[PDB]
Symmetry: D2
Subunit: 162 residues, 4 copies
Amino acid sequence: VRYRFLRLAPDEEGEGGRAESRILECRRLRAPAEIARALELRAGETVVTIRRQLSMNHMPTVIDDLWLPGTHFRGLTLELLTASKAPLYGLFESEFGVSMVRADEKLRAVAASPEIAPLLGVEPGRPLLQVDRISYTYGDRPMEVRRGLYLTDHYHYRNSLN
Amino acid sequence: VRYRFLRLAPDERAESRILECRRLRAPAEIARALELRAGETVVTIRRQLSMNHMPTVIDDLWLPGTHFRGLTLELLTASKAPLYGLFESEFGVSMVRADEKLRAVAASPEIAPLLGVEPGRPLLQVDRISYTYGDRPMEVRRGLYLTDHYHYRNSLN
Amino acid sequence: VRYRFLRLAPDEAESRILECRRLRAPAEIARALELRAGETVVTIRRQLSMNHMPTVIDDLWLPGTHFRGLTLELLTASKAPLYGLFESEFGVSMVRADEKLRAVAASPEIAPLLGVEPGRPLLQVDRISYTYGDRPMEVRRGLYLTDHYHYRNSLN
Amino acid sequence: VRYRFLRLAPDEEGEAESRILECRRLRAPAEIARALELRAGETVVTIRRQLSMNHMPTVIDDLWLPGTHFRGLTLELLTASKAPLYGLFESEFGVSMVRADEKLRAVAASPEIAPLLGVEPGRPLLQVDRISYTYGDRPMEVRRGLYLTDHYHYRNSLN
Ligand SMILES: [Cl-]
Ligand SMILES: [Cl-]
Ligand SMILES: [Cl-]
Ligand SMILES: [Cl-]
Ligand SMILES: [Cl-]
């Protein structure tokens, strides 16, 4: 299936035109300390980071920043990402054998930063939905940190609660 | 326990105050969400939640009159009870599920002062429909959250 | 990704299609799918195996109007997980599911299909899946053998 | 409100009484120590209790709590309490659960459990093994529940 965790849904009637992904950045770096703690890494551990844009109905809707433990994702390259017709979580499953069983999220409303605003086609200060996620594999092992910034003007985040 | 659906968590306990309580003919949208007849009477409440002495949420709720008859400002403001608990104990309506739609919005001129912010300030808007037994809708609740000290926590399977 | 709703997890999955048939909706099925009475539905029975042993028996009911062309030939011609097929071939994506879980005794009918004795405790998962607009699109009844696997759930 | 995590819902149309069976302090079993992220040999409080609905036994729950945080938890406190257990943990002990992770399976009623649910040994029960978490992902409870799902089911919504 198309999505693992994405809760974007259109405001208007119909099936959510499916998200198109475009990789913006891809680098390896030393984990910032907050990242290393979220991923239960040793200080100084290398992480792969990706920035991507999701677009829906030909309009940018999400800017995602992801951080992955360098250890498990050594094979991850820009060439792989950009050639890949897969959604990221599907890629992590098929190429890297990493399947997420749970995600813990923290949602807030924030102002569009000077850096983010033009990537979403908006003015700085525009309210955006920030979704900070840590995703877990089996045994409560953290394997991804993702911070999403969502422009919720034509789309909402759908949540059912028990 | 203290909370039924509230997902506010500190980045590093809620106190409620009733702003408004009123009975009226259900607006179209409400009648639809609550699956009421046209113009059926509903009770509407506006309320403010604060945490750590600071305003955090404004909620507008709409409830079907026929299940919430005794529901008065007097019952409310004399109530030292959370609203879902009041609905359970006093009215015998327990919620089994809620469906929510979350968005980020600019603080409206109406809401902004109620949260101590400038109009335009980013707020989390949580539109909820709560269901009781039989997939029966019992409440429409629109919440505007100031997320400067608090976030909305969610776990996904 | 591989799964939409499946919560089976190893204490530490291959699908075989048994049937795919059109019939008039049984009453409980038309009610759940909100169909006119006796509306045509497609029903599927399938078996999931994990580690080369049968683990789940699923029965599924889908509205015929949205699943025209959903045949045994298609299901066998195709590689796809059923939810992925419903999205890619039929354009039906599930946004929500409501489930009811019970422990039940393996019925004389189901016990042989899981390789167990009638009476054996099974996890019964009764699901209704919804698409956009809170339209029910699927009724799925699963019976799960939970001797090596459990159903994982996180609660808020 | 009445329930924190309980997902029991009746099969029959429409809209739960607790009785303490056992209570004591013990050295954590190794698996319990691991679930609660305790040091080896830490003391836990353990409670068994019965839930009934419609004046019939429906649930047997076994609970393990960190002895450190739950020093004042006594039998006399429990049986005098008019509160739901999660309500007591909140109000008396300041422990509030933000999340529960569960593992559900169908099991045979054991000779020990069966009499307490009014069933015969071998009857199918739903086992719900739970770890509950407070803020910061700190585990504060292990609960194993055994549910008779003959007139009740476990309701779950999935996104
Ligand atoms: Cl590009
Ligand atoms: Cl008040
Ligand atoms: Cl979920
Ligand atoms: Cl939940
Ligand atoms: Cl007694």
